Short mmCIF file of C-alpha atoms and ligand atoms in Angstrom, two decimals:
data_model
loop_
_atom_site.label_atom_id
_atom_site.label_comp_id
_atom_site.label_asym_id
_atom_site.label_seq_id
_atom_site.Cartn_x
_atom_site.Cartn_y
_atom_site.Cartn_z
CA UNK A 1 13.95 -40.24 -25.43
CA UNK A 2 11.68 -40.00 -22.14
CA UNK A 3 14.17 -39.32 -19.21
CA UNK A 4 13.20 -40.42 -15.87
CA UNK A 5 14.69 -38.59 -12.87
CA UNK A 6 14.63 -40.62 -9.74
CA UNK A 7 15.45 -38.99 -6.19
CA UNK A 8 19.73 -40.50 -6.61
CA UNK A 9 19.89 -42.92 -3.93
CA UNK A 10 16.69 -49.39 -4.71
CA UNK A 11 14.00 -46.78 -5.37
CA UNK A 12 15.00 -46.27 -9.40
CA UNK A 13 12.78 -48.89 -9.96
CA UNK A 14 9.50 -47.82 -9.69
CA UNK A 15 10.31 -44.94 -11.62
CA UNK A 16 12.30 -47.97 -14.12
CA UNK A 17 8.98 -49.93 -13.86
CA UNK A 18 6.93 -47.21 -15.80
CA UNK A 19 9.90 -46.79 -18.02
CA UNK A 20 9.53 -50.64 -19.09
CA UNK A 21 5.95 -49.68 -19.72
CA UNK A 22 6.57 -47.11 -21.51
CA UNK A 23 8.99 -48.82 -24.09
CA UNK A 24 6.58 -51.84 -24.24
CA UNK A 25 4.59 -48.92 -25.98
CA UNK A 26 7.37 -48.16 -28.21
CA UNK A 27 9.27 -45.21 -26.20
CA UNK A 28 12.69 -45.23 -25.95
CA UNK A 29 13.65 -44.31 -21.64
CA UNK A 30 16.83 -42.97 -20.60
CA UNK A 31 17.76 -43.77 -16.71
CA UNK A 32 19.59 -40.49 -14.99
CA UNK A 33 21.31 -40.79 -12.60
CA UNK A 34 24.69 -39.76 -10.65
CA UNK A 35 28.71 -39.69 -11.69
CA UNK A 36 28.90 -41.46 -8.75
CA UNK A 37 25.78 -43.72 -8.99
CA UNK A 38 26.63 -44.21 -12.85
CA UNK A 39 30.40 -45.23 -12.13
CA UNK A 40 29.59 -47.61 -8.92
CA UNK A 41 26.22 -49.59 -9.44
CA UNK A 42 25.17 -52.25 -12.99
CA UNK A 43 23.07 -50.39 -15.67
CA UNK A 44 19.52 -51.26 -15.44
CA UNK A 45 20.34 -52.78 -19.65
CA UNK A 46 17.67 -52.97 -22.07
CA UNK A 47 15.20 -51.06 -22.75
CA UNK A 48 17.26 -48.22 -21.30
CA UNK A 49 19.85 -46.10 -21.46
CA UNK A 50 21.76 -44.72 -18.66
CA UNK A 51 23.19 -40.95 -19.18
CA UNK A 52 24.26 -38.64 -16.03
CA UNK A 53 24.26 -35.64 -13.89
CA UNK A 54 26.25 -34.66 -10.50
CA UNK A 55 25.64 -34.07 -7.09
CA UNK A 56 29.00 -32.13 -6.47
CA UNK A 57 30.53 -35.98 -5.82
CA UNK A 58 31.58 -37.57 -8.92
CA UNK A 59 33.94 -40.32 -6.89
CA UNK A 60 32.11 -40.62 -3.56
CA UNK A 61 28.43 -40.90 -1.91
CA UNK A 62 26.91 -37.01 -1.60
CA UNK A 63 25.29 -38.23 0.79
CA UNK A 64 27.92 -39.78 2.90
CA UNK A 65 29.92 -36.28 2.75
CA UNK A 66 27.23 -34.52 3.57
CA UNK A 67 24.56 -36.06 6.03
CA UNK A 68 23.13 -32.51 7.03
CA UNK A 69 19.74 -32.74 4.63
CA UNK A 70 19.62 -29.45 3.96
CA UNK A 71 23.22 -29.24 2.39
CA UNK A 72 23.15 -31.92 0.82
CA UNK A 73 20.04 -30.78 -0.92
CA UNK A 74 21.26 -27.20 -1.91
CA UNK A 75 24.18 -29.07 -3.42
CA UNK A 76 22.36 -31.22 -5.51
CA UNK A 77 20.20 -28.28 -6.22
CA UNK A 78 23.50 -26.64 -7.77
CA UNK A 79 25.16 -29.32 -9.70
CA UNK A 80 22.02 -31.16 -10.21
CA UNK A 81 20.44 -28.23 -12.22
CA UNK A 82 23.75 -26.75 -13.73
CA UNK A 83 24.18 -30.24 -15.32
CA UNK A 84 20.95 -31.40 -15.82
CA UNK A 85 20.64 -28.53 -18.14
CA UNK A 86 24.20 -29.06 -19.78
CA UNK A 87 22.55 -33.05 -19.98
CA UNK A 88 19.51 -31.71 -21.64
CA UNK A 89 21.47 -29.81 -24.49
CA UNK A 90 24.63 -32.83 -25.15
CA UNK A 91 21.09 -35.08 -25.62
CA UNK A 92 19.59 -32.81 -28.10
CA UNK A 93 23.37 -32.46 -30.06
CA UNK A 94 23.85 -36.40 -29.96
CA UNK A 95 20.12 -36.45 -31.97
CA UNK A 96 18.20 -37.68 -28.79
CA UNK A 97 16.55 -34.64 -27.90
CA UNK A 98 14.42 -35.04 -24.29
CA UNK A 99 10.67 -35.45 -25.50
CA UNK A 100 9.34 -35.05 -21.73
CA UNK A 101 11.34 -35.42 -18.26
CA UNK A 102 9.36 -37.48 -16.22
CA UNK A 103 11.45 -36.63 -12.22
CA UNK A 104 10.99 -36.90 -8.04
CA UNK A 105 9.29 -33.55 -7.21
CA UNK A 106 11.57 -33.90 -4.47
CA UNK A 107 14.19 -32.13 -7.05
CA UNK A 108 11.63 -28.80 -8.19
CA UNK A 109 14.82 -27.54 -10.01
CA UNK A 110 14.31 -30.72 -12.27
CA UNK A 111 11.16 -29.22 -13.94
CA UNK A 112 12.69 -25.61 -13.85
CA UNK A 113 15.73 -27.18 -15.73
CA UNK A 114 13.76 -29.18 -18.22
CA UNK A 115 10.74 -26.43 -19.24
CA UNK A 116 13.86 -23.73 -19.58
CA UNK A 117 14.89 -26.41 -22.10
CA UNK A 118 11.75 -26.41 -23.38
CA UNK A 119 11.44 -30.53 -22.64
CA UNK A 120 7.67 -30.94 -20.93
CA UNK A 121 7.44 -32.06 -17.39
CA UNK A 122 6.11 -35.01 -15.60
CA UNK A 123 5.86 -35.43 -11.76
CA UNK A 124 6.15 -39.14 -10.26
CA UNK A 125 5.56 -39.31 -6.73
CA UNK A 126 6.30 -42.47 -5.09
CA UNK A 127 4.24 -41.94 -2.14
CA UNK A 128 1.05 -42.15 -0.84
CA UNK A 129 -2.48 -40.00 -2.13
CA UNK A 130 -3.16 -39.55 1.45
CA UNK A 131 0.09 -38.76 2.54
CA UNK A 132 0.90 -36.38 -1.07
CA UNK A 133 -2.21 -34.77 -0.81
CA UNK A 134 -1.97 -33.50 2.81
CA UNK A 135 1.44 -32.33 2.04
CA UNK A 136 -0.44 -30.65 -1.21
CA UNK A 137 -2.94 -28.77 0.88
CA UNK A 138 0.08 -27.32 2.94
CA UNK A 139 1.51 -25.79 -0.71
CA UNK A 140 -1.54 -24.57 -1.35
CA UNK A 141 -2.12 -22.42 1.91
CA UNK A 142 -5.44 -23.77 2.67
CA UNK A 143 -3.65 -25.59 6.07
CA UNK A 144 -0.90 -23.73 7.89
CA UNK A 145 2.38 -25.24 10.13
CA UNK A 146 1.70 -27.39 12.01
CA UNK A 147 -0.73 -30.15 10.85
CA UNK A 148 -2.78 -30.98 13.43
CA UNK A 149 -5.65 -34.15 13.67
CA UNK A 150 -8.03 -31.48 13.66
CA UNK A 151 -7.16 -30.64 10.38
CA UNK A 152 -6.83 -34.04 9.66
CA UNK A 153 -10.88 -34.62 10.52
CA UNK A 154 -12.00 -31.91 8.68
CA UNK A 155 -10.53 -34.10 5.90
CA UNK A 156 -11.58 -37.24 6.81
CA UNK A 157 -15.39 -35.35 6.96
CA UNK A 158 -15.10 -34.01 3.53
CA UNK A 159 -14.68 -37.53 2.19
CA UNK A 160 -10.53 -36.27 0.90
CA UNK A 161 -9.15 -38.92 3.80
CA UNK A 162 -11.01 -42.39 3.58
CA UNK A 163 -9.99 -42.79 7.85
CA UNK A 164 -9.15 -40.23 9.99
CA UNK A 165 -6.13 -39.75 11.06
CA UNK A 166 -4.88 -38.88 15.04
CA UNK A 167 -1.25 -38.13 16.13
CA UNK A 168 0.41 -40.84 15.96
CA UNK A 169 -0.88 -41.35 12.50
CA UNK A 170 -0.31 -37.67 10.68
CA UNK A 171 2.43 -37.76 8.60
CA UNK A 172 5.40 -35.61 10.70
CA UNK A 173 6.69 -33.62 8.46
CA UNK A 174 4.14 -31.53 9.05
CA UNK A 175 2.60 -32.32 12.05
CA UNK A 176 6.39 -31.52 14.11
CA UNK A 177 7.87 -29.82 11.30
CA UNK A 178 10.31 -28.73 13.70
CA UNK A 179 11.77 -32.12 14.23
CA UNK A 180 13.69 -32.32 10.49
CA UNK A 181 12.86 -28.54 9.02
CA UNK A 182 14.33 -29.60 5.73
CA UNK A 183 11.83 -32.88 4.73
CA UNK A 184 9.38 -30.54 6.01
CA UNK A 185 10.48 -28.00 3.77
CA UNK A 186 10.94 -30.77 0.97
CA UNK A 187 7.54 -32.07 1.85
CA UNK A 188 5.66 -29.14 1.09
CA UNK A 189 7.66 -27.74 -2.01
CA UNK A 190 7.17 -31.03 -4.23
CA UNK A 191 4.02 -29.38 -5.10
CA UNK A 192 5.10 -25.66 -5.73
CA UNK A 193 5.04 -25.47 -9.40
CA UNK A 194 3.46 -28.61 -9.95
CA UNK A 195 0.65 -27.60 -12.04
CA UNK A 196 2.97 -25.77 -14.73
CA UNK A 197 4.13 -29.83 -15.24
CA UNK A 198 2.41 -31.50 -18.08
CA UNK A 199 1.27 -34.71 -16.47
CA UNK A 200 1.19 -35.26 -12.70
CA UNK A 201 1.79 -39.15 -11.79
CA UNK A 202 1.40 -41.12 -8.39
CA UNK A 203 2.35 -44.67 -8.20
CA UNK A 204 -0.43 -45.93 -6.46
CA UNK A 205 -3.82 -47.35 -7.41
CA UNK A 206 -7.47 -45.87 -6.88
CA UNK A 207 -8.83 -48.83 -5.58
CA UNK A 208 -6.94 -48.78 -3.02
CA UNK A 209 -6.70 -44.90 -2.00
CA UNK A 210 -10.12 -44.31 -3.02
CA UNK A 211 -10.84 -40.74 -2.36
CA UNK A 212 -8.16 -39.81 -2.10
CA UNK A 213 -6.64 -40.46 -5.60
CA UNK A 214 -10.57 -38.71 -6.54
CA UNK A 215 -9.38 -35.96 -4.78
CA UNK A 216 -5.10 -36.13 -6.18
CA UNK A 217 -6.74 -36.39 -9.64
CA UNK A 218 -9.10 -32.88 -9.03
CA UNK A 219 -6.89 -31.03 -7.23
CA UNK A 220 -3.18 -31.73 -8.77
CA UNK A 221 -4.15 -33.89 -12.34
CA UNK A 222 -2.70 -36.87 -10.65
CA UNK A 223 -3.33 -40.33 -12.65
CA UNK A 224 -2.66 -43.76 -11.15
CA UNK A 225 0.01 -45.40 -12.83
CA UNK A 226 1.03 -48.23 -9.80
CA UNK A 227 1.75 -50.12 -8.02
CA UNK A 228 4.86 -49.67 -10.37
CA UNK A 229 6.11 -53.15 -9.92
CA UNK A 230 6.92 -56.14 -12.38
CA UNK A 231 4.25 -57.45 -14.31
CA UNK A 232 5.39 -60.52 -13.95
CA UNK A 233 4.33 -60.66 -9.80
CA UNK A 234 0.91 -58.72 -11.41
CA UNK A 235 0.17 -61.32 -12.98
CA UNK A 236 -0.02 -59.45 -16.35
CA UNK A 237 1.49 -61.58 -19.58
CA UNK A 238 1.90 -58.70 -22.35
CA UNK A 239 5.33 -59.04 -23.38
CA UNK A 240 1.87 -69.57 -6.75
CA UNK A 241 5.34 -70.88 -8.09
CA UNK A 242 7.96 -67.66 -9.00
CA UNK A 243 9.12 -68.46 -12.56
CA UNK A 244 11.54 -65.46 -11.72
CA UNK A 245 13.89 -67.13 -9.84
CA UNK A 246 17.34 -66.31 -8.73
CA UNK A 247 19.72 -68.29 -6.99
CA UNK A 248 19.96 -65.73 -3.45
CA UNK A 249 21.13 -68.05 -0.57
CA UNK A 250 18.55 -66.51 1.89
CA UNK A 251 16.18 -67.80 -1.42
CA UNK A 252 17.50 -71.81 -0.46
CA UNK A 253 16.80 -71.48 3.27
CA UNK A 254 13.56 -70.30 2.41
CA UNK A 255 12.02 -73.22 0.14
CA UNK A 256 12.70 -75.49 3.07
CA UNK A 257 10.41 -73.63 5.58
CA UNK A 258 6.80 -74.93 5.64
CA UNK A 259 3.77 -72.55 4.16
CA UNK A 260 3.26 -69.18 4.93
CA UNK A 261 5.43 -69.75 8.12
CA UNK A 262 8.47 -66.99 7.67
CA UNK A 263 8.38 -63.38 9.40
CA UNK A 264 10.31 -61.44 7.28
CA UNK A 265 11.57 -57.99 8.56
CA UNK A 266 12.93 -55.14 7.11
CA UNK A 267 13.09 -51.76 8.25
CA UNK A 268 13.98 -50.34 4.60
CA UNK A 269 17.08 -48.52 3.73
CA UNK A 270 17.35 -45.31 5.61
CA UNK A 271 16.37 -45.39 8.80
CA UNK A 272 19.38 -46.34 11.81
CA UNK A 273 18.09 -48.17 15.02
CA UNK A 274 20.56 -48.12 17.81
CA UNK A 275 22.10 -51.17 19.91
CA UNK A 276 18.88 -51.02 21.55
CA UNK A 277 15.85 -51.28 19.80
CA UNK A 278 17.77 -53.61 17.56
CA UNK A 279 18.12 -55.56 20.95
CA UNK A 280 14.12 -55.44 21.35
CA UNK A 281 13.64 -56.08 17.70
CA UNK A 282 15.76 -59.50 17.52
CA UNK A 283 14.41 -61.01 20.35
CA UNK A 284 11.23 -59.83 20.36
CA UNK A 285 11.40 -62.32 16.84
CA UNK A 286 13.35 -65.18 18.88
CA UNK A 287 10.76 -65.07 21.12
CA UNK A 288 7.99 -65.34 18.73
CA UNK A 289 9.40 -68.79 18.02
CA UNK A 290 8.66 -68.17 14.64
CA UNK A 291 10.86 -68.62 11.78
CA UNK A 292 12.71 -65.12 10.27
CA UNK A 293 14.45 -63.97 7.54
CA UNK A 294 15.94 -60.35 9.18
CA UNK A 295 17.52 -58.17 6.91
CA UNK A 296 19.73 -56.06 8.91
CA UNK A 297 22.29 -53.84 6.74
CA UNK A 298 25.64 -53.77 6.29
CA UNK A 299 25.94 -50.41 7.19
CA UNK A 300 23.62 -51.49 10.26
CA UNK A 301 24.73 -54.79 10.90
CA UNK A 302 28.29 -53.30 13.70
CA UNK A 303 24.85 -53.03 16.15
CA UNK A 304 23.74 -56.44 16.43
CA UNK A 305 25.86 -58.30 18.95
CA UNK A 306 27.43 -61.85 19.14
CA UNK A 307 24.63 -63.30 21.27
CA UNK A 308 21.98 -62.28 19.80
CA UNK A 309 23.41 -62.75 16.46
CA UNK A 310 23.45 -66.52 17.80
CA UNK A 311 20.20 -66.62 19.36
CA UNK A 312 18.75 -66.39 16.26
CA UNK A 313 20.37 -68.98 14.58
CA UNK A 314 17.83 -71.20 16.55
CA UNK A 315 15.01 -70.42 13.69
CA UNK A 316 16.50 -67.50 11.84
CA UNK A 317 18.29 -65.79 9.28
CA UNK A 318 20.12 -62.36 9.22
CA UNK A 319 20.99 -60.97 5.78
CA UNK A 320 22.34 -57.53 4.57
CA UNK A 321 19.67 -57.34 2.15
CA UNK A 322 17.48 -59.74 0.29
CA UNK A 323 14.70 -60.18 -2.88
CA UNK A 324 12.67 -58.32 -1.13
CA UNK A 325 9.58 -59.19 -3.98
CA UNK A 326 10.96 -62.38 -4.48
CA UNK A 327 10.48 -63.38 -0.96
CA UNK A 328 6.78 -61.87 -0.28
CA UNK A 329 6.20 -64.22 -3.14
CA UNK A 330 7.49 -67.16 -1.79
CA UNK A 331 5.42 -70.02 -0.53
CA UNK A 332 6.82 -69.90 2.83
CA UNK A 333 6.38 -66.32 3.79
CA UNK A 334 3.61 -65.76 6.42
CA UNK A 335 3.79 -61.91 7.74
CA UNK A 336 6.00 -58.84 7.17
CA UNK A 337 7.38 -56.32 10.05
CA UNK A 338 7.95 -53.95 7.93
CA UNK A 339 8.43 -50.12 8.58
CA UNK A 340 5.24 -50.01 5.93
CA UNK A 341 7.35 -47.35 3.70
CA UNK A 342 5.31 -47.30 0.30
CA UNK A 343 7.45 -49.16 -2.08
CA UNK A 344 7.63 -52.36 1.16
CA UNK A 345 3.70 -51.57 1.21
CA UNK A 346 2.75 -51.64 -2.09
CA UNK A 347 5.07 -55.10 -2.54
CA UNK A 348 3.31 -56.76 0.32
CA UNK A 349 0.00 -55.60 -0.90
CA UNK A 350 0.69 -57.85 -4.55
CA UNK A 351 1.49 -60.50 -2.83
CA UNK A 352 -0.86 -60.25 -0.23
CA UNK A 353 0.75 -60.35 2.58
CA UNK A 354 0.01 -59.09 6.04
CA UNK A 355 1.93 -56.65 7.97
CA UNK A 356 3.06 -55.65 11.04
CA UNK A 357 3.62 -52.17 10.40
CA UNK A 358 6.81 -50.59 12.88
CA UNK A 359 6.92 -47.19 11.64
CA UNK A 360 9.57 -44.13 12.14
CA UNK A 361 8.76 -40.82 9.93
CA UNK A 362 7.70 -40.03 6.54
CA UNK A 363 4.75 -41.54 4.81
CA UNK A 364 4.90 -45.17 7.63
CA UNK A 365 2.68 -43.12 10.16
CA UNK A 366 0.32 -42.49 7.94
CA UNK A 367 0.68 -45.45 5.83
CA UNK A 368 0.69 -47.96 8.83
CA UNK A 369 -2.57 -45.98 10.00
CA UNK A 370 -4.42 -46.71 6.79
CA UNK A 371 -3.20 -50.33 7.56
CA UNK A 372 -4.35 -51.61 10.31
CA UNK A 373 -8.11 -49.64 9.92
CA UNK A 374 -9.05 -48.80 5.94
CA UNK A 375 -7.18 -51.66 4.55
CA UNK A 376 -7.36 -54.27 7.12
CA UNK A 377 -4.00 -55.73 6.47
CA UNK A 378 -2.48 -56.11 9.87
CA UNK A 379 -1.57 -54.82 13.41
CA UNK A 380 0.10 -51.62 14.29
CA UNK A 381 3.42 -51.92 17.42
CA UNK A 382 1.86 -49.74 20.30
CA UNK A 383 5.00 -48.23 21.86
CA UNK A 384 5.75 -47.81 25.56
CA UNK A 385 4.45 -44.14 27.11
CA UNK A 386 8.13 -43.24 26.47
CA UNK A 387 7.98 -44.09 22.69
CA UNK A 388 10.16 -47.26 23.12
CA UNK A 389 8.95 -50.52 20.97
CA UNK A 390 9.49 -53.66 23.43
CA UNK A 391 10.61 -57.07 22.73
CA UNK A 392 7.31 -58.30 23.96
CA UNK A 393 5.29 -56.19 21.73
CA UNK A 394 7.39 -57.56 18.60
CA UNK A 395 6.43 -61.00 20.17
CA UNK A 396 2.55 -59.98 20.47
CA UNK A 397 2.06 -58.97 17.06
CA UNK A 398 3.79 -61.40 15.38
CA UNK A 399 1.60 -63.61 17.09
CA UNK A 400 -1.92 -61.67 16.70
CA UNK A 401 -1.63 -61.91 12.39
CA UNK A 402 0.11 -65.39 12.74
CA UNK A 403 -2.35 -67.23 15.29
CA UNK A 404 -5.05 -64.42 16.24
CA UNK A 405 -8.43 -64.46 16.85
CA UNK A 406 -8.26 -62.51 13.70
CA UNK A 407 -5.17 -63.53 11.64
CA UNK A 408 -8.10 -64.77 8.46
CA UNK A 409 -9.27 -61.18 8.72
CA UNK A 410 -5.72 -59.75 7.11
CA UNK A 411 -4.92 -62.01 5.36
CA UNK A 412 -8.11 -61.65 3.69
CA UNK A 413 -7.74 -58.26 3.41
CA UNK A 414 -4.74 -58.67 2.00
CA UNK A 415 -6.19 -61.49 -0.70
CA UNK A 416 -8.76 -58.58 -1.65
CA UNK A 417 -6.06 -55.85 -2.06
CA UNK A 418 -3.75 -57.61 -3.78
CA UNK A 419 -6.44 -58.62 -6.37
CA UNK A 420 -7.59 -55.59 -6.63
CA UNK A 421 -3.83 -53.75 -7.04
CA UNK A 422 -3.58 -56.84 -10.31
CA UNK A 423 -6.56 -55.82 -12.20
CA UNK A 424 -5.30 -52.06 -12.23
CA UNK A 425 -2.58 -52.84 -13.61
CA UNK A 426 -3.78 -55.09 -15.62
CA UNK A 427 -4.66 -54.09 -19.42
CA UNK A 428 -7.96 -51.95 -18.79
CA UNK A 429 -7.65 -51.50 -15.42
CA UNK A 430 -7.55 -48.31 -13.82
CA UNK A 431 -3.46 -47.95 -13.77
CA UNK A 432 -3.36 -49.05 -16.47
CA UNK A 433 -5.41 -46.26 -18.72
CA UNK A 434 -3.40 -43.53 -17.32
CA UNK A 435 -0.06 -45.97 -18.34
CA UNK A 436 -1.12 -46.30 -22.24
CA UNK A 437 -2.51 -42.05 -22.07
CA UNK A 438 0.64 -41.40 -21.34
CA UNK A 439 2.68 -43.43 -24.00
CA UNK A 440 0.59 -42.25 -27.19
CA UNK A 441 0.63 -38.24 -26.04
CA UNK A 442 4.45 -38.90 -25.84
CA UNK A 443 4.56 -40.63 -29.19
O1 UDP B 501 16.26 -56.47 1.65
C1 UDP B 501 15.92 -55.57 1.04
C2 UDP B 501 15.50 -54.46 1.34
C3 UDP B 501 14.88 -53.52 0.97
N1 UDP B 501 14.79 -53.47 -0.92
C4 UDP B 501 14.08 -53.04 -1.71
O2 UDP B 501 14.23 -51.11 -1.01
C5 UDP B 501 12.92 -50.91 -0.95
C6 UDP B 501 12.82 -49.88 0.21
O3 UDP B 501 11.53 -48.98 0.00
P1 UDP B 501 10.50 -48.60 1.23
O4 UDP B 501 9.95 -47.24 0.26
O5 UDP B 501 9.69 -49.42 1.69
O6 UDP B 501 11.46 -47.52 2.40
P2 UDP B 501 12.73 -46.69 2.19
O7 UDP B 501 13.75 -47.41 2.19
O8 UDP B 501 13.18 -45.62 1.22
O9 UDP B 501 12.52 -46.07 3.10
C7 UDP B 501 11.80 -51.63 -1.29
O10 UDP B 501 11.31 -51.00 -3.35
C8 UDP B 501 12.27 -52.86 -1.40
O11 UDP B 501 11.82 -53.96 -2.24
C9 UDP B 501 15.30 -54.90 -0.95
O12 UDP B 501 15.16 -55.35 -2.67
N2 UDP B 501 16.16 -55.86 -0.26
#
């Protein structure tokens, strides 16, 4: 089998989509998740098998149980490494010895476990080459902590980054590591021992990040294999209207709105917004006058007031979750106010949707700088002198992407990069070639 081990978390999907392409080439993929996830979510179905490891919490969410990130990661290491070793053996004794383990390098222990079982290893980077190479330069002891704008400027000048990153653009996990010690460590340790792997893969495409992808290839052997999204969305027949059309209620609401009218709004599945920040965001939405689809997760929605909910009835719809790809592909969608996590960003690119970037941390500040300055596909919200996002700024940015003098600039770039994304994943494209090379290596 090809074992697929994402970080246990929507974001099995990029690795799953990679695994679907390997199944097209005749390989046999297995999704490896936690016992808890395997008990409490439906499996992927054909062409996947499913298997499990433990993170120490088989009957409740370990992440909820251990909200301190270092504690959660040490527990997942201890239990995960034990149980992954047991799974490699049980697999072999069942007549399915693993050919290769494709794993998220936030799990380094998984590489060591697999290699000690004699199983080939393929790291799967799920963040942009621009961010990954900065973490790798710190891992390789070419940059000290903290990483500064001066350090990023050198990388720019040397042709490795394609844009000059300022203070609000460098990755905070290394530019302000004291804020998030575990996340600093996890981001750097991704790279420690990556040179031992058989393969290194990244969910990006070369045309998007050319200098950064070329440096990741030459430095870390990283091969671009994305955007790792469903083939439908990439216009790839091998096997405007969406033939993959669901029955989700929010989609029915979208069908009633005019073309390119709707603002999709999401800050993803991990960040939390306090009542004050929800209020700024929501009132900005309403003040814009645009139709909007606002994703407010079930675990966050207690923070929404009655009155702000009611204000959003006029032109908006609030949902706990949406089929984000299907939304972004819909003809009514005019822009995406996103935290600019990488998955959301790639989904916006593949659909040619302009962005309003509202980053928090992780990869999002850096991505947001690329969206506004290199890619040209949107704008970034400007925080006040106290670091607060104001309703007026939410509104301004929405209006500036939908109505401003540069409206066509952001759409033109979005559409340009859409086409290049689709090219990369179609037959003979830069990312398809690397997928086919890997499939043949493990056949
Ligand atoms: O209502 C939602 C919110 C999110 N997602 C999916 O969740 C992922 C979020 O990943 P991202 O890297 O953007 O941010 P994170 O959630 O990890 O911060 C993407 O694949 C989204 O399409 C979705 O399908 N529906």
